[PDB]
Amino acid sequence: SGRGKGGKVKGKAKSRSNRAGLQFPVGRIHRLLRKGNYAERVGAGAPVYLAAVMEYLAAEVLELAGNAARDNKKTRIIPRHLQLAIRNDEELNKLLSGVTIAQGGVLPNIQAVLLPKKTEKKA
């Protein structure tokens, strides 16, 4: 208030429902998935698995990044590692790619990108 702190204020707003950090709630996740036309709903237990997968991926990336940082005698990883060391890893690069210039084999579609044959020519 003006006079002082009459009541109890603490967080951004006054509600029992409140989000402490920059975390993503189920509702927000659903919103994002729908915005990308990926899915409408998520099964029970799936969010738990999804989180584990994400943490696993992050762990691998952080492992490489952290090791590379130490190689450069740095205490904190610098952006140079993300544009160099992280760009050298084929595994990470594979998942960081989508259909564009074919890097790996995984190209989701009907046939292979090269195509097994030529087309028909008209006379």
């Binding site: 975390q23 927000r28 899915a39 738990v48 698995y49 952080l62 904190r76 960081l96 995984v106």
Partner: protein, 122 residues
Amino acid sequence: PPKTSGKAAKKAGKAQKNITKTDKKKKRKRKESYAIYIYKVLKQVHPDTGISSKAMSIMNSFVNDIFERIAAEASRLAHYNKRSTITSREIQTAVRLLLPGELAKHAVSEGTKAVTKYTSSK
């Protein structure tokens, strides 16, 4: 404590909220973040190692894209089952479709741990 904030941001802006190094960099429609996850997992793999704010900004965008790519496979698989829901069935297969089996078998085990500990984070 006695002496409070004199100025407030809410006004007209010139450049993006006239920010000059003081705040958190907000741009490119970035909304909320996996920083908590990354900062938590980082110290579990590399405790003595830290990260710059600049790197974190790119790191979060990089790791997020990896999951986005996997989410695409989930929608791909659900499309075969003629459904619009993501379950363990899709997740497991999606990971095995992009990530090598050698690593995929580790992810599954990690997921089993999360479900058993009922924790949505390490």
